[PDB]
Amino acid sequence: SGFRKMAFPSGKVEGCMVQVTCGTTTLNGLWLDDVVYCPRHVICTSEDMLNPNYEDLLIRKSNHNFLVQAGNVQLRVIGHSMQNCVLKLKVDTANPKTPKYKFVRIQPGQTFSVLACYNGSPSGVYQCAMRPNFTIKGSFLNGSCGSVGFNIDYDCVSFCYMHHMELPTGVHAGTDLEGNFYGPFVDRQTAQAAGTDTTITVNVLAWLYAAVINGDRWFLNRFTTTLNDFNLVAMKYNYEPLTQDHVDILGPLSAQTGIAVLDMCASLKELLQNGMNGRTILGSALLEDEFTPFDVVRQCSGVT
Amino acid sequence: SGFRKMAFPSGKVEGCMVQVTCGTTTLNGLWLDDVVYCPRHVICTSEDMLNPNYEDLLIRKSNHNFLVQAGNVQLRVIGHSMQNCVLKLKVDTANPKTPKYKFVRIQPGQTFSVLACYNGSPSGVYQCAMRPNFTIKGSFLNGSCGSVGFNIDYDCVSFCYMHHMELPTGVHAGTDLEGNFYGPFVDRQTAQAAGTDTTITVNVLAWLYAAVINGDRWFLNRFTTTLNDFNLVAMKYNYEPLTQDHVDILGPLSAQTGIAVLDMCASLKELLQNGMNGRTILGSALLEDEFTPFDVVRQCSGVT
Ligand SMILES: Cc1ccncc1NC(=O)C[C@@]12CCC[C@@H]1C2
Ligand SMILES: Cc1ccncc1NC(=O)C[C@@]12CCC[C@@H]1C2
């Protein structure tokens, strides 16, 4: 028992972290096989940042200008290319620590662990969610660009995120491992509108099930609701509309606990309308939305 | 910017995790040099659990009865001994993945990362605090015993905790790496009183500084207080009494932000007396106490 915002063990990813320098800029790179991936803004200087001409800047760079260091050793760069907003530096040595891996594009509302790095060195690991508006509320300082987000299924690391930018609002933006930004963001030092965010309803429901499994039951009530009635409340409180697909994914939790998904929806409805009344659920005084139904099952059963 | 409940990267600890079996029981062990450490209750059966005679049970066990597996390989046990509530199994092979390490006894109120494991395999990593009453509110299921708590200073892992038990209340109890329980707990399946817990005041203050550094400022006010006046409020709200030693440790944060520690104490006093008024601080709707002043400085500066 007990429920925590658990991150995946970061070992397999730590062995992939390298430092990438180009001119004055140093950031993090991801070394997999004989390729190092990093944000393309490593080639910029402060004068470029407002609106960099990435193709033009990269043309002034040669393989020898990209300094790649895996802690103690220097990697020899034999090729460079820009794919979307990432640079792929072909090195002459395959990373001996390369785990089984996949590059995946996650959906908004899904969760992942971030291994925050500085100068190719890991400082910490935290679990977070891709917001419905494609931003992440992370912890990133200058130098952390290139730090990656990932999930682990047994021994295979699915890399889903690479950090690129902090918006003027202090929220974070990044790309998949093919360099495509999540959301409407561009890698420029400009004010950029992030979409209207919403709370990930399916995740809040999954977390309410985790609470029941672990003893916090005070919020359970004598009521039920419908998808339509619940979605009217979710609309008012800026929550993601719940669909039968979300009800379906909550099936194992509904089955384990015997609490019908719509009955849990009714508990959520009363919590949205009345608040917590100074009480807590799993150590939180708000409705947590960074645990997917998959995260709840995995943690509640001991999946390694 | 951004502030997260960050855990240390778990790589160095993952390479130390092994599986220990004795009879029907399987739990986790920590392999450092040529020694495997694990909770001594691995030698019990359900009939023993109410009040095991550990010395008597261990006498019925030989080196060959302790099955130690480091994932793929079986370790040869050449010695066994019980030190307090831990068993130390001498193996014929030193762990090639042994990092620089220390065994430390942490103080209540200090924080650390837990690498939750099952059958010698890591499932996740989370940051937590040793409560003033020596319990930890973790996430541990059956089989997680032997999972360890630790801190990392550059390349040296300081192991501070080994998980042993879940109290009837669902709170967790464990030992240092010499097998000494934190708190008054004994490794028996009995109801055991945990002391009256309190909120770690110095940590809440450190977290209020992290909030200011990262933009959340609404709670700052036109007031100041004294240690005596503040401690009267802390007494009423079951918070740890603040001392000049705590004020001293908050020095770097007071210096960085220009907010005198007693002025921050006055903001905390008003938050205790009035609540959050439906607002949040760093994504939380309560006063967070799992970040030490050291954690705040490390995270706010990018220490790897
Ligand atoms: C300073 C910082 C802190 C945390 N996370 C990211 C950053 N860096 C940036 O945002 C750099 C830029 C803006 C210009 C193009 C390139 C993305
Ligand atoms: C079942 C479980 C779940 C999570 N954390 C720990 C446990 N296990 C125990 O508490 C076992 C005992 C009680 C008897 C002696 C030995 C400590």
Task: Report yes or no: B256 and B223 within 8 Å, Cβ to Cβ.
Answer: no
Outline where chain B has alpha helix (H): 11-14, 54-59, 201-213, 227-236, 244-249, 251-257, 261-274, 293-301
Encoded tokens for A167:
């918006």
| Eight-class DSSP state of B201 | H
Which of B79, B99, B119 is a domain's end point? B99
Nearest residue, CB atoms, A124 vs list B7, B139, B215: B7
Residues with CB under 6 A from ligand 1: A 41, 49, 140-142, 144-145, 164-166, 187-189
Name the DSSP class of B141.
-
The helix (H) or strand (E) run that includes residue B27 is strand B25-32
Phi, then psi, of A49 in degrees rounded to 5: -45, -35
Q: In angstroms, rounded to a whole number, what is the distance separating the alpha carbons of residues B107 and B118? A: 27
| Whether residue B144 is found in the same domain as residue B6 | yes
Pair B233, B262 in one domain = yes
Residue A236 and residue A214 share a domain: yes
Angle at A288 between CA A141 and CA B173, to 5 degrees: 90
Which residues on neighbouring strands pair with residue B199, listed in sequence order?
A: B239
C-alpha to C-alpha distances, A24 to A40, A68, A294, B304, nearest whole angstrom: 14, 13, 43, 20
Which chain B residue has the Cα nearest residue A11?
A: B11
Cα separation, A88 vs A103, whole angstroms: 14
Domain that holds residue B178: 1-14+100-197
Number of residues assigned to chain B: 304
Q: How far apart are CA B20 and CA B120, in angstroms?
A: 8
Distance A145 CA to ligand 1 centre (A): 7
Verify that A206 and A296 share a domain, yes or no: yes
Contact B148, B115 (CB under 8 A): yes
Q: Identify the burial level of B224 via C-beta atoms within 10 angstroms of its C-beta, where 0-12 means exposed, 13-18 middle and 19 or more buried.
A: middle
For residues A46 and A182, state if they share a domain. Answer: no
Q: How far apart are CA B106 and CA B100, in angstroms?
A: 18
Helix (H) or strand (E) holding B152: strand B148-153
Residue whose pair of structure tokens reads 């209540």 in the numeric block: B108
**Angle formed by the axes of helices B261-274 and B201-213, nearest 10°:** 100
* Beta-bridge partner residues of A163: A174
A219 shares a domain with A87: no
Amino acid at A36: V
> Exposed/middle/buried for A212, CB within 10 Å: 0-12, 13-18, 19+?
buried
Rg (CA), chain B: 21
**How many angstroms separate the CA atoms of B203 and B200, rounded?**
6
Structure tokens at B181: 């329980």
Look up the CATH number of the domain holding residue B276.
Answer: 1.10.1840.10
Residue with CA nearest ligand 2 atom 14: B189
Strand B148-153 versus strand B111-118 pairing type: antiparallel
Q: Cα(first)–Cα(last) distance of chain A, in Å?
A: 16
Task: Identify residue B169 by its one-letter amino acid code.
Answer: T
Write out the two tokens for B238. 């079951």
CATH number for the domain that contains residue A58: 2.40.10.10
| Phi, psi angles (nearest 5°) of residue B96 | -65, -25
Yes or no: say if B200 and B287 are a contact pair by the CB < 8 Å rule: no
With helix as H, strand as E and coil as C, how does chain A read?
A: CCCCCCECCCHHHHCCEEEEEECCEEEEEEEECCEEEEEHHHHCCCCCCCCCCHHHHHHCCCHHHEEEEECCEEECEEEEEEECCEEEEEECCCCCCCCEEEECCCCCCCEEEEEEEECCEEEEEEEEECCCCCCECCCCCCCCCCCEEEEEECCEEEEEEEEEEECCCCCEEEECCCCCECCCCCCCCCCCCCCCCCECHHHHHHHHHHHHHCCCCCCCCCCCCCHHHHHHHHHHCCECCCCHHHHHHCHHHHHHHCCCHHHHHHHHHHHHHHCCCCCCECCECCCCCCCCHHHHHHHHHCCC
- B27 CB neighbours in chain A (<8 A) are none
Angstrom CA distances, B303 to A128, A133, A294, B167, stand at 20, 30, 32, 36
* CA-B44 nearest atom, ligand 2: 15
Angle between helices A201-213 and A293-301 (to 10 degrees): 20
Q: Does residue B7 sit in the same domain as residue B106?
A: yes
- Using CA atoms, how far apart are residues A254 and A234, in angstroms rounded to an integer? 20
C-alpha torsion A41→A46→A50→A54, nearest 10: -40
Q: How many Cβ atoms from other residues are within 10 Å of residue A201's Cβ?
A: 24
Q: If you search the block for the tokens 């993945």, which residue do you land on?
A: B97
**Distance of alpha carbon B193 from alpha carbon B185, whole angstroms:** 8
Last residue of a domain, one of A197, A225, A242: A197
- Among partner residues B126, B284, B299, which is closest to A7 by beta-carbon distance? B126
Contact between B124 and B103 (Cβ < 8 Å): no
Structure tokens at A39: 């944000």
Q: Are B231 and B242 in contact (CB under 8 A)?
A: yes
Task: Find the angle CA(B169)-CA(B173)-CA(B174) to the nearest 5 degrees.
Answer: 165
Structural tokens at position B135: 């319990």
Kind of pairing, strands A66-70 and A17-22? Answer: antiparallel
Would you call B198 helix, strand, or coil by DSSP? coil
- Say if residue A64 is exposed, middle or buried (CB neighbours under 10 Å; 0-12, 13-18, 19+): exposed
Q: How far is CA B243 from the centre of its chain?
A: 23
Total number of domains in chain A: 3
Domain boundary among A99, A128, A162: A99
> What's the token pair of residue B124?
């996740």
* B182-B186-B187-B193 Cα dihedral, nearest 10 degrees: -90
For residues B166 and B32, state if they share a domain.
Answer: no
Q: Ligand 2 pocket test: which of A1, A4, A299 has the largest number of ligand atoms within 8 Å of its C-beta?
A: A1
Chain-centre distance of CA A16, in angstroms?
A: 18
CA of B297 relative to ligand 1 center, distance in Å: 21
Q: Which residues of B are catalytic?
A: 41, 145
- Please indicate, yes or no, whether residues A4 and A148 belong to a single structural domain of this protein: yes
**Residue B295 tokens, joined:** 């954690």
| B214, closest residue in chain A (CA to CA) | A170
DSSP one-letter string for B95-133: -TT--EEEE--PPTT-EEEEEEEETTEEEEEEEEE--TT
What distances in angstroms separate CA A71 from CA A54, A121, A150, A153, A220, one per listed residue? 28, 8, 22, 27, 52
Helices first, then strands: H and E counts in chain B: 8, 13
Provide φ and ψ at B148, rounded to 5°. Answer: -115, 155
Do B265 and B291 belong to one domain?
A: yes
| Same domain for A169 and A142 | yes
The yes-or-no answer on residue A265 being catalytic is no
C-alpha closest to that of A283 among B147, B124, B285, B142: B285
Q: Which residue from B91, B89, B140, B131 is spatially nearest to B111, judged by alpha carbons? A: B131
A269 token code pair? 């409805």
The CA distances from residue A224 to A229, A238, A274, B144, in Å, are: 10, 21, 16, 37
The contacts of residue A65 (CB under 8 Å, 6+ apart) are A22, A23
Experimental method: X-ray
Clarify whether residues B125 and B216 are in a common domain.
Answer: no
> Vertex B85, ends B82 and B90: CA angle to 5°?
35
Q: Does the distance separating the beta carbons of B123 and A172 come in below 8 Å?
A: no
Bridge partner list, B26: B21
Question: Distance between CA A241 and CA A36 in Å, rounded?
Answer: 40
- Report which of B168, B223, B188 is spatially closest to residue B39, judged by C-alpha positions: B188
CB within 8 Å of chain A, chain B residues 230-269 = none
Distance from first CA to last CA of chain B, Å, rounded?
A: 16
* Backbone phi, psi, residue B162, to 5°: -130, 130
Q: Which residues are B83's β-sheet partners? A: B86
A145 is catalytic: yes
Question: How many C-alpha atoms does A229 have within 13 Å on its Cβ side?
Answer: 12
Contact B115, B14 (CB under 8 A): yes
